[PDB]
Amino acid sequence: KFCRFTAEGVQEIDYKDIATLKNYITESGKIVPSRITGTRAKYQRQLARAIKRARYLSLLPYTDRH
Amino acid sequence: PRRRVIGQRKILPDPKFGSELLAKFVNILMVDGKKSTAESIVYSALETLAQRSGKSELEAFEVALENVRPTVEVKSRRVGGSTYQVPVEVRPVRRNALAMRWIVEAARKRGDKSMALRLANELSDAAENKGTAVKKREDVHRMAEANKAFAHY
Amino acid sequence: RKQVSDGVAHIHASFNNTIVTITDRQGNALGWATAGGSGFRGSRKSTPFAAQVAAERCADAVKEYGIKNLEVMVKGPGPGRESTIRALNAAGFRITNITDVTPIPHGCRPPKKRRV
Amino acid sequence: PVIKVRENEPFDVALRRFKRSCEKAGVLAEVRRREFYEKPTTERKRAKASAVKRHAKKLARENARRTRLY
RNA sequence: CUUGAGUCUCGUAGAGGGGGGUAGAAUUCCAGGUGUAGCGGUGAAAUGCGUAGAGAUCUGGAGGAAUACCGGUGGCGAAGGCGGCCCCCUGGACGAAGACUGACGCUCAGGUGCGAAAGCGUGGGGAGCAAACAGGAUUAGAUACCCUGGUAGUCCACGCCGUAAACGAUGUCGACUUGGAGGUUGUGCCGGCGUGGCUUCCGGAGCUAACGCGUUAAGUCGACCGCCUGGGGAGUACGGCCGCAAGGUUAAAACUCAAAUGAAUUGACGGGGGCCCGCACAAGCGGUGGAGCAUGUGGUUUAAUUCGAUGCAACGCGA
Ligand SMILES: [Mg+2]
Ligand SMILES: [Mg+2]
Ligand SMILES: [Mg+2]
Ligand SMILES: [Mg+2]
Ligand SMILES: [Mg+2]
Ligand SMILES: [Mg+2]
Ligand SMILES: [Mg+2]
Ligand SMILES: [Mg+2]
Ligand SMILES: [Mg+2]
Ligand SMILES: [Mg+2]
Ligand SMILES: [Mg+2]
Ligand SMILES: [Mg+2]
Ligand SMILES: [Mg+2]
Ligand SMILES: [Mg+2]
Ligand SMILES: [Mg+2]
Ligand SMILES: [Mg+2]
Ligand SMILES: [Mg+2]
Ligand SMILES: [Mg+2]
Ligand SMILES: [Mg+2]
Ligand SMILES: [Mg+2]
Numbered sequence: 001k002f003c004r005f006t007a008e009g010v011q012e013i014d015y016k017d018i019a020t021l022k023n024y025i026t027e028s029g030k031i032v033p034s035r036i037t038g039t040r041a042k043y044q045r046q047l048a049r050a051i052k053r054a055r056y057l058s059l060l061p062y063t064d065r066h
Numbered sequence: 067p068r069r070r071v072i073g074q075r076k077i078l079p080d081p082k083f084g085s086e087l088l089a090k091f092v093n094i095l096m097v098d099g100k101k102s103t104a105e106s107i108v109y110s111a112l113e114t115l116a117q118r119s120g121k122s123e124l125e126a127f128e129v130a131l132e133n134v135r136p137t138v139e140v141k142s143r144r145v146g147g148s149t150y151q152v153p154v155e156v157r158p159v160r161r162n163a164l165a166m167r168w169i170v171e172a173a174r175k176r177g178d179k180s181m182a183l184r185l186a187n188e189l190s191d192a193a194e195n196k197g198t199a200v201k202k203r204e205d206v207h208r209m210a211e212a213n214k215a216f217a218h219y
Numbered sequence: 220r221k222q223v224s225d226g227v228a229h230i231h232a233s234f235n236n237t238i239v240t241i242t243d244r245q246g247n248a249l250g251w252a253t254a255g256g257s258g259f260r261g262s263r264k265s266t267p268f269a270a271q272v273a274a275e276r277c278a279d280a281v282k283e284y285g286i287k288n289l290e291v292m293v294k295g296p297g298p299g300r301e302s303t304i305r306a307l308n309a310a311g312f313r314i315t316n317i318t319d320v321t322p323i324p325h326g327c328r329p330p331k332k333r334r335v
Numbered sequence: 336p337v338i339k340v341r342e343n344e345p346f347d348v349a350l351r352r353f354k355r356s357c358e359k360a361g362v363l364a365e366v367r368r369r370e371f372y373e374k375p376t377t378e379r380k381r382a383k384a385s386a387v388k389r390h391a392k393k394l395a396r397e398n399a400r401r402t403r404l405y
Numbered sequence: 406c407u408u409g410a411g412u413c414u415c416g417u418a419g420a421g422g423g424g425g426g427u428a429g430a431a432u433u434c435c436a437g438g439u440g441u442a443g444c445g446g447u448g449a450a451a452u453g454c455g456u457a458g459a460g461a462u463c464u465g466g467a468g469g470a471a472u473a474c475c476g477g478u479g480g481c482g483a484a485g486g487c488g489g490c491c492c493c494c495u496g497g498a499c500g501a502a503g504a505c506u507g508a509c510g511c512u513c514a515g516g517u518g519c520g521a522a523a524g525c526g527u528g529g530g531g532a533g534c535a536a537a538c539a540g541g542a543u544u545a546g547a548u549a550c551c552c553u554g555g556u557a558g559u560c561c562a563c564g565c566c567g568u569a570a571a572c573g574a575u576g577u578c579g580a581c582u583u584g585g586a587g588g589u590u591g592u593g594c595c596g597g598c599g600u601g602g603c604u605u606c607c608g609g610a611g612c613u614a615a616c617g618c619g620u621u622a623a624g625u626c627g628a629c630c631g632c633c634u635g636g637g638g639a640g641u642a643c644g645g646c647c648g649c650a651a652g653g654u655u656a657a658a659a660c661u662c663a664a665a666u667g668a669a670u671u672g673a674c675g676g677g678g679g680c681c682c683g684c685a686c687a688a689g690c691g692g693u694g695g696a697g698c699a700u701g702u703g704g705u706u707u708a709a710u711u712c713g714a715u716g717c718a719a720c721g722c723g724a
Contacts (some may be wrong), residue, residue, distance in 0.1 A: 026359075026360060027336075027337075027356075027360075028336065028360050030360065064336070064337055
């Protein structure tokens, strides 16, 4: 568990933080459910939003079969 | 059955060669509880079978069995109305039993005169894969190999 | 006639049949084999065993190309996804990568459910 | 699911890693789920019913632990 | 007058709405490469596609539609509904500290607006799916289920339609009345202690025909509105209004029955589930059904062919 965003006092997950984002995507690029990462629902919605900004900018992939 | 309270029944070895394998052969040959009548047929054919191949009484009978013993057979299992033939390995006790039955049923459908002669000719054709007892072992194998794709439930 | 020694095996394992295509690295097919063309029809065609045989035949077909190292792409839901891969390794190739490439829409409306 | 066979790794455990790798992304599970069109009135119905049983199994497992069978 | 109602200041969450733009996966089609005999589909097949080179694989392009994962008995909205990402325009809710107005409130027949999908009109578009339709099966038949195709439609703009199991089968507003476990979104203080909004489940008293509801009541009350008066005939006919139509709405009677109905109980049954058993299957051996004869029965005949048993459980049975 242990939603890491509540502990670090974040306000926005900042899609440009690809180093952080990659801890929340699967080997195939799929976002990881909050049942597994223990993220609070509020930040999971920002995280899922931020991943989709990165995928558009090609900072993160949609899939491993591009 | 559902319960499985089945224990095996002890079968006496034959009067001559002390072979329990031949004793079950006589029982399979026996008709209407005439064990003495069938022992004479089995012994007379084995007296002929030995002198015709020179090998022996028992291992001339054994070499015919190894050419008729089946290794894998098919059991029907219904899934969706159409029956699936599922090949299954034959356990060792059934392999001897199946070879013995196919030999006896082969000799009963022959044109030879005496059943002792009918069996003696049939055992010999089993020795070099010429008989209809060996034919059915091939048929059982081809059916099992044809359905080899279904080797699971 | 040509030698390659590095190819890709594309397995198309659907519910009804499996197709084994061995290509070069650029996508130019060399030989292929199918469960249906390997002596199996109907129920026997959709079995994992039929996939294994179709794998051996394709390995038996592309033997005049001298492939040694083989990538594997598995596409489809079929029961021949796994047996085909094992039959290629047993056939004598060096399996380098095993990749599932099954198409997943992120698309079009599927057909209607069967009322059977 | 990309898997790379590593040195001194036999085929069996490399293939097995492919079993786990595909199952983890469940590429086979959504393949079935997309094979036929599923109306929005039934996907809401299955989702709702799946939650009900998951809650119902929690209450059953909880209340059993206070009950002895012998 | 300030407690109901509302205004202002700061912020929070949100698939709320409308307009535009863009992304990636996949399908389909078009062209080309490699390559060879099948593919596809089913319970099984065939129709169908393929040696005029398919299917598989790869490269490039066109196009339309929907947005995997996140995703959650999560959120937003009056309801219908709303899901990639970005911008623009815009609605509501909520919280904390006050300030402000001063009963400005609640409900609402008629009226007005919104209202899934299908459908309709005009003009576009059209990948996938798919009423109608065609063929192949299945079948006693099969105007179906299944398969191969496939047109309206589904998509967009504008206008109509105005109905749904439009459901929580539960009108709206307000007050009061034990608890527990959650989810979601604020916020004060020091992971803990509060305080608000919304929401899910269990349950107490009470209520209920019962099932159940239970601070989000189907409990205790108040205000207003809508509706019901046995089943069928019938939400039908006629009339009026509305609609391009399809039809919507308002809404009978003759006649007919003595019930129709709700909930729960005990069985029985299920081509429901689970767990067991039996020459029930399976594994085997020998039979019957064919022949001749014995014997019983049926039918027919006869003056009479005595009467009785006549699915399993009558028929070498009373005998
Ligand atoms: Mg289909
Ligand atoms: Mg305002
Ligand atoms: Mg009102
Ligand atoms: Mg009104
Ligand atoms: Mg419509
Ligand atoms: Mg139209
Ligand atoms: Mg038009
Ligand atoms: Mg169809
Ligand atoms: Mg209505
Ligand atoms: Mg609804
Ligand atoms: Mg509902
Ligand atoms: Mg109603
Ligand atoms: Mg309750
Ligand atoms: Mg009417
Ligand atoms: Mg009218
Ligand atoms: Mg039997
Ligand atoms: Mg007879
Ligand atoms: Mg009589
Ligand atoms: Mg009487
Ligand atoms: Mg009588």
